[PDB]
Amino acid sequence: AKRIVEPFRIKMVEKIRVPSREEREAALKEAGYNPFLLPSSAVYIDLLTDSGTNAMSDHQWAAMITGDEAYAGSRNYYDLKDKAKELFNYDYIIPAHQGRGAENILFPVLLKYKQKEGKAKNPVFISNFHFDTTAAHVELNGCKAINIVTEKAFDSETYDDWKGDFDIKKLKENIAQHGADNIVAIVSTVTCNSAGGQPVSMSNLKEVYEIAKQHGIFVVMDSARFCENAYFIKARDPKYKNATIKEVIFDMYKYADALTMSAKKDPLLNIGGLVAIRDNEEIFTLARQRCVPMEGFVTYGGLAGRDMAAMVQGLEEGTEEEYLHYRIGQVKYLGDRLREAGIPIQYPTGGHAVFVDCKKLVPQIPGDQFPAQAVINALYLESGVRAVEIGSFLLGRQKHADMEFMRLTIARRVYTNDHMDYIADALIGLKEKFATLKGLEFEYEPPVLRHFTARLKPI
Amino acid sequence: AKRIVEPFRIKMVEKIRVPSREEREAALKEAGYNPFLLPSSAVYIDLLTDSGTNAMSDHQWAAMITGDEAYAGSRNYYDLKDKAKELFNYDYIIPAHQGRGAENILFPVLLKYKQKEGKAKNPVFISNFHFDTTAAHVELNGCKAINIVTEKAFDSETYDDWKGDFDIKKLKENIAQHGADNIVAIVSTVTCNSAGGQPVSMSNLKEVYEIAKQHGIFVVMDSARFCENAYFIKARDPKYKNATIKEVIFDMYKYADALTMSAKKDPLLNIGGLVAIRDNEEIFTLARQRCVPMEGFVTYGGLAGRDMAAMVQGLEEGTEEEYLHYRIGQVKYLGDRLREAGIPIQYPTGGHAVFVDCKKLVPQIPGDQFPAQAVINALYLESGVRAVEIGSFLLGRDPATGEQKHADMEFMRLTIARRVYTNDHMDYIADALIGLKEKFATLKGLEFEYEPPVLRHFTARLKPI
Amino acid sequence: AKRIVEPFRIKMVEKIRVPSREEREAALKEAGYNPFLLPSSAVYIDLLTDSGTNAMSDHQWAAMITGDEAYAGSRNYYDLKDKAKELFNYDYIIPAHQGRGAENILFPVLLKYKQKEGKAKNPVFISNFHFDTTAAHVELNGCKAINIVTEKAFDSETYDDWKGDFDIKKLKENIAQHGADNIVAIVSTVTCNSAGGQPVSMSNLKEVYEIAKQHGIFVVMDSARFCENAYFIKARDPKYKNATIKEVIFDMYKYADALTMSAKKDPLLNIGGLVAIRDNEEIFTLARQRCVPMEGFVTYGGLAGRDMAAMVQGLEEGTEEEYLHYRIGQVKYLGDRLREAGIPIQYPTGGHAVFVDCKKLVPQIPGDQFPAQAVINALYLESGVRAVEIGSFLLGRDPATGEQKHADMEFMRLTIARRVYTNDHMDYIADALIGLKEKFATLKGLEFEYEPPVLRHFTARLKPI
Amino acid sequence: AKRIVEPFRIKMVEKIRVPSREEREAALKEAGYNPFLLPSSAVYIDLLTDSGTNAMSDHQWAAMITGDEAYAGSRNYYDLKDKAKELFNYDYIIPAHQGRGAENILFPVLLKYKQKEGKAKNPVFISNFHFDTTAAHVELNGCKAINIVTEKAFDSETYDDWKGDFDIKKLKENIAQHGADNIVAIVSTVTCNSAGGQPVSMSNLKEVYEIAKQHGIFVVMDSARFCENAYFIKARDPKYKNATIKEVIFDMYKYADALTMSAKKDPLLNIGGLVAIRDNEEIFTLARQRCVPMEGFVTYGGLAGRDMAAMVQGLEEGTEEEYLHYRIGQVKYLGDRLREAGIPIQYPTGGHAVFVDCKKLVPQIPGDQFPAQAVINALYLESGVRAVEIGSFLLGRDPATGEQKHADMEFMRLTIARRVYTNDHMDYIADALIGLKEKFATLKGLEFEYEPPVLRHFTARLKPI
Ligand SMILES: C=C(/N=C/c1c(COP(=O)(O)O)cnc(C)c1O)C(=O)O
Ligand SMILES: C=C(/N=C/c1c(COP(=O)(O)O)cnc(C)c1O)C(=O)O
Ligand SMILES: C=C(/N=C/c1c(COP(=O)(O)O)cnc(C)c1O)C(=O)O
Ligand SMILES: C=C(/N=C/c1c(COP(=O)(O)O)cnc(C)c1O)C(=O)O
Ligand SMILES: c1ccc2[nH]cnc2c1
Ligand SMILES: c1ccc2[nH]cnc2c1
Ligand SMILES: c1ccc2[nH]cnc2c1
Ligand SMILES: c1ccc2[nH]cnc2c1
Ligand SMILES: c1ccc2[nH]cnc2c1
Ligand SMILES: [Cl-]
Ligand SMILES: [K+]
Ligand SMILES: [K+]
Ligand SMILES: [K+]
Ligand SMILES: [K+]
């Protein structure tokens, strides 16, 4: 395992504390054995998500302080529009308060657009893998969310360069089965969060887009972790060995018609989202009409001016290769600590998190008992580390998936490699108990995005 | 007119500038004679809205710096829950990114909740006056938005204590006509923004709530400007002359079952919203289920932790009587400068804005040529001040005929952000409008260069005639 | 009286409050009847000083956030060096933590420099008027501080354009009497704080410098309020009617060899100072050698990097004519409110404060009973406004006699921080002082309960008579 | 070597960069082969000092935002006074802009106090080891600075628990030689910076103070790194094994009469200093009288209010044992990386820096050719890391002879700012120095191009040989 030094130094700290074992047991009981319902005061190192927990730079805070809070025509709106043109070559933007706000703006518009001419009676979205909010918005609008990630993603220990790729054979099969007139959009998720933060190759994005254009299908790039994807393309595709990260990004967005983005990920923010559209003015106009009631007026989109300002700066910082090398290298370091100790993980590690394969760590659990959640809860009790489940629990409707990950999710520029060692050493310490204590049931199950507020029972 | 001194001093400033007349003429032309299309760089004093443009305190900024950005279980979420219990006596909260986010969380839930009982067959919402976003959410969910403000609100020049009140007679006529089965909720808007920021009396809130309950009707308090409403109750209702602002607020919320709030108004924020529910845990659970896909996880609701932190502090600051007296007194000062010069306004002034009645200023301009927009544009060209139209332009066309809907009032709204502008800025505004008195009679009406089929007020491009 | 609108809007506020009358009486007694010993919690509007109490801009706070805290070679040091070259055409800088630190760096070096040449046998400094800290440093180094302001400054009610001017006849007389060999430096104080914030004309600065150069005498510009001085030159000297403020500043600094600056004044800071030297590298090197033990390493001079960053930005903002017009216009407004009501002031008002002439206002209180302090204390008890004395109390006792020094000027200074208070705060101050019209006669003097052997106005305790 | 995890997480970052070898070559030549003259833009990891380069907490920044900038009576002054009473049990405070400002306030006052008693005819100060600014103020006031650290400090490789201790035999010998009447004060430096950041035991502080009291000698605690010293006492003195850090601090300050503090060290600030006096009100009063001309008014002492606020919070954070364990553990980690690779260091490592013994690394370079500076320059060219010399270059010339003063130790100090760098930064530092092991034997010394007569290490220009 190799430690890579921060390409920055620390300018402001935030205190953390280790709650006592008694506190942790009490807190997990009070939370119904669901870490989503734990208070932050009961958590030491928080690995629930890399979303919105990032550390900003002094330049981002400075941008916030001079942000323009105007209701209409904020300076920072125009700066953000210019930044989207620079990075993606897209001519239209709509800010949103975060990624699922961007989805709520755009997906219903794309559906109604497709329903023109009386077609799309059996509407579907197709993705390498829809994230949970993404699929929820697809289904809330009466559509099916189809996932067709490469089968290589399902072999955790076997290395592959591009475990986020679309399965192209399945893309063509689904077009033939459903018909192009029923495919509202193809969603290219970069990196592929559900597969383990695994990258999509440039050739895969390109072929998917060429197929989509053959059939007149609109392509949306789900862009929360687009810079991590671009880094992997530079690292693993020899064609881009000597390209800049921004050159890689520019090419990626040749292979979509629009993007939805949670800027709470790679743009290094605590809040913020974005819709950008390459050149379809009609869809832009319709999306603006939905933005107004759902998010806010179209030049702030549910964001304070200071957050548009932070986003303009964060979009730049998130592309910096030295930063990306360190960030992705820290995730790799945590994974290598675990793998060298015999802990099974999705290999190679993705951009933002280490995905621990609990199907191999705890094969004696079925999806009936959510294997990765029993691991997560045991780790929390042992160490005060909070992680999150990316398996049957999150996928929804006991529908068992093809992956049962515990996601040790790593915020950007927050934790050191000594925090990583603490995480790894704590889990490595659980090895005599992975068989003892095990299993979980439901008490309360929401019908949509159940994992966030459900209460569970062990056995 | 009386100037009331600030109960604070200035700690940080932001430069503003007056573009040259040549630059203002070019900018208005480029914006299609629609100030909503102007960049902020072309605006000197911005009176488009009081929403999200407020100046925060040093304590609010300090709260932001120590805010907890945890995705689940932020320290500031629990502080916000405790604050809602303190102020409103409500037991459940869901943060939202702003007021229309709170509406999107709660209103669909209220409709489905009533549909589930075999009711809401032909559903409606009733308010003293639904704000634009509020009505849009009512209509997006297949319901009609019925507004029944007191008739006193339509006599602009005649003083009344409570121009935001519900018309109780119309409330009963609408209940008889639609039946309680079809009334998804009553929305008590405090202050009543669309009537001119005018207050709703305590006795009116109470009587509306009593009628609603006797009919099984859920009541939502639209609370963006709840502190300004509380101030007017203390100022004008003898029974509350010696009450604290917080005591007034506590009584107000005895007369709703829940609240939706834009915290971009009275809680002195640049972003933020809130749903609070008094004690109906089922509705709270259903609203949480909608919050997750639309806004965010239920302990941040689409806000950064720093903004929940700022909201907890701003909720306190927005109740402070010395601040409210100064804030509402500044609005009154602007109004009295205008009224004393013969400019007709909605009288008395409300909490957050002066509404200028443009019918009388430009009688050569009929309603379908947007008299208030012509005055706003002349004001901008004269001074760099940007105001907003609450008249025929905003009102739109009648779907049945395609013709301009008859505007009951043609208002220019001079909307005042909190703790941002001084009374010398107010004088600049008033002097600019007063100085146009001779020009009013020769202002030209407006027609459409480009009219969108919806939301024309925001993006339509206009031409002088 | 004319109110001039702010060329900015408020972005962050800070609460203030009025202590009750009972609290003000108790507080003044505990402070030994010296407002310098009052806590800020006992003060409503604080007019003790314009030093370090200014409101910064969002750009200044942004500059602080990205400031370089390096001990050696901070980015912001080089930015500050460039800014001094831009504004003054001076090639060398040494930051200092504030103005009296700059004086402590430079004045002992100028003395030693004059001595190493075999001169300065009986050394003196000459100024239009040395500020208190400035004179203290002159005297701590064994020199006499000679003040030779124009006699026009002593006629408070009679308007003059340049009440801060040197008396040129007295300058020549003092050089002839003491000898050029004994004049360590001439200090041109701009504006002339002790005369009432009153400007020095360009022609006066030039003549003083020309005389100095003919004699080989070094000239230091005491530059705390250099932008206010530049504004008055543009306003009152027809030669500069169409010059920019920066053009005026550039010309001013042709008439010194170095500057000492409290950046807590016109550069709009809460802390900060500066030495700049035009081109004498030997004096620069010697000043750096004193900086190291007294202030800090030579690239931060006792300041955090963020404060050098704020100074770079504030130096720019402090030169902006729109801001200066408003700032000086607010001081003028307070002065005109008072003068129109018959209160005697130093007329015209200076840049930063209204100086109320208390010899005229309370002639029944002898100088050694501190007439201006009796007014100040009386104003504080009546209103919670804290002002400061610039008269006998500040002046102290004569060493040769042990008795009170006779003062030419007996001012109560209403000192105005920059961008902090509105003109409605000014009205509060004026109305409070005007309301004391009838009590002015009954005002007692005061007597000492304990007197510092030196620095009595900062730490002494008083009792009424 | 053992890595200790941060008891915090990162909330804000600042970009750093490795200049190219070409850039480093050009920058070092321009800086005259003296890293003190490098711009920070030429430095990758800056180990010049732990003074003022620390990372603050969100709570410290929040305290700054609400800081009271009042010239007299700031809220934060009273908070700081209370904090000094809590931590030290001292009843009087004077803020200062930084540590050498506190020295400038207090040391001249202690001399005058001893002189007016008829004493101090041939005055000296005695310390375990005076830091260079501290000795400079002693000498500037006409006194001799006597250093009497334990001889154990000069055996770098041999462990000892208390390498900062006073040599008690030498203390009694110096009292006998000079006489108590001539000893103005004893200065207890904690930790002993010049000995390698090495701690002073509680029993040593106590015996020194008991000896001082026997003879009527005033004791000052130089307290820049008092929390690091307290940590070492808890770690190494069994009497305090179960004491809190604050309990250790409280006992330490039973053994002084006053303190001078650079708050740019253990209180985790970028600027700030402090004088505190236990109970001698006369010395407090005299110190206040010097504060006014040199630093500022007595309730801010040359600091912005926001910096007094940050100091109140940092004083608390600097005592937290979990933080001290990590901070001191990081320094020990760097030291163990070096020592495990055969690089000689002062062992055990102290609180704030690793001191590399270059007398052992480059024996072929004599002291007057600055062996430690040769190592420092090689490290900079190899890696972009800037370190500082604590050896013959710093020590300077004997004023009697004009030749090199003999250095008892030739240290390269790798000084670590608090909460700024990670242990992976430490690995970069260590790997860079370890990779030079074969180059050391052929490094050449340095000679002068420009040499100040007083403090040549801060500004001298050198050339290789
Ligand atoms: C919350 C995270 N994900 C959000 C996300 C979203 C939704 O973004 P917001 O959380 O900003 O609504 C959309 N698309 C992808 C690929 C995502 O990963 C997370 O992975 O924890
Ligand atoms: C934008 C403003 N109003 C918002 C508003 C809203 C919507 O809040 P947001 O703008 O925070 O979505 C809801 N209810 C009332 C009574 C309102 O006044 C405005 O009046 O300009
Ligand atoms: C403190 C103020 N004056 C400071 C000052 C100083 C001393 O600056 P500091 O207060 O920053 O040390 C020097 N020269 C002049 C002309 C000054 O006005 C005051 O006028 O209240
Ligand atoms: C600058 C550091 N030392 C400052 C210092 C000082 C002087 O403090 P200021 O740098 O804050 O003036 C006084 N006493 C001790 C023991 C010190 O270590 C340093 O060690 O690099
Ligand atoms: C894991 C954790 C939090 C999330 N919020 C949205 N999707 C998520 C996945
Ligand atoms: C197997 C194959 C290729 C790999 N690249 C990195 N680790 C690997 C393991
Ligand atoms: C005026 C100003 C802003 C608005 N946002 C929504 N409706 C509005 C009316
Ligand atoms: C008046 C006010 C503040 C001062 N600081 C130093 N001298 C002063 C005189
Ligand atoms: C090394 C580094 C910085 C210093 N400041 C004062 N003496 C020093 C020695
Ligand atoms: Cl109906
Ligand atoms: K967040
Ligand atoms: K806003
Ligand atoms: K200050
Ligand atoms: K610093």
Author numbering:
A (entry chain A): 2 to 398, 405 to 466
B (entry chain B), C (entry chain D), D (entry chain C): 2 to 466
Which lines from the publication concern this structure?
Tryptophan indole lyase (TIL, EC 4.1.99.1) is a pyridoxal-5′-phosphate (PLP)-dependent enzyme that catalyzes the reversible cleavage of L-tryptophan to indole and ammonium pyruvate (eq 1). The reaction mechanism of TIL is of interest since it catalyzes the β-elimination of a carbon–carbon bond with a formally poor leaving group, indole. The functional assembly of TIL, and the asymmetric unit, is a homotetramer. The active site is formed in a dimer at the interface of two monomers.
S-Ethyl-l-cysteine (SEC) is an alternative substrate for TIL in vitro.(17,24) However, in contrast to the reaction of l-Trp, the elimination reaction of SEC is irreversible. SEC forms a prominent quinonoid peak at 508 nm when mixed with TIL; addition of BZI results in the decay of the quinonoid peak and formation of the 345 nm peak of the aminoacrylate intermediate. Chains A and D are in a 1:1 mixture of open and closed conformations, while chain B is open and chain C is in a closed conformation. None of these chains contain an intact SEC molecule; all four chains contain a PLP-aminoacrylate complex with BZI bound. The open conformation in chain B shows a clear density for the ligands. The hydrogen-bonding contacts of the PLP-aminoacrylate complex are very similar to those of the closed aminoacrylate complex formed from l-Trp, but the BZI binding mode is different. Although Asp-133 is in the rotated-out conformation, it still has a weak hydrogen bond with N1 of the BZI (3.3 Å), and N-3 accepts a hydrogen bond from Tyr-72* (2.7 Å). The distance from the aminoacrylate β-carbon to N1 of the BZI is 3.8 Å, significantly farther than 3.0 Å in the closed BZI complex. In contrast, the aminoacrylate complex formed from SEC primarily has the BZI bound in an open conformation, which retains the hydrogen bond from Tyr-72* and to Asp-133, but lacks the hydrogen bond with His-458. This suggests that elimination of ethanethiol from SEC can occur in the open conformation.
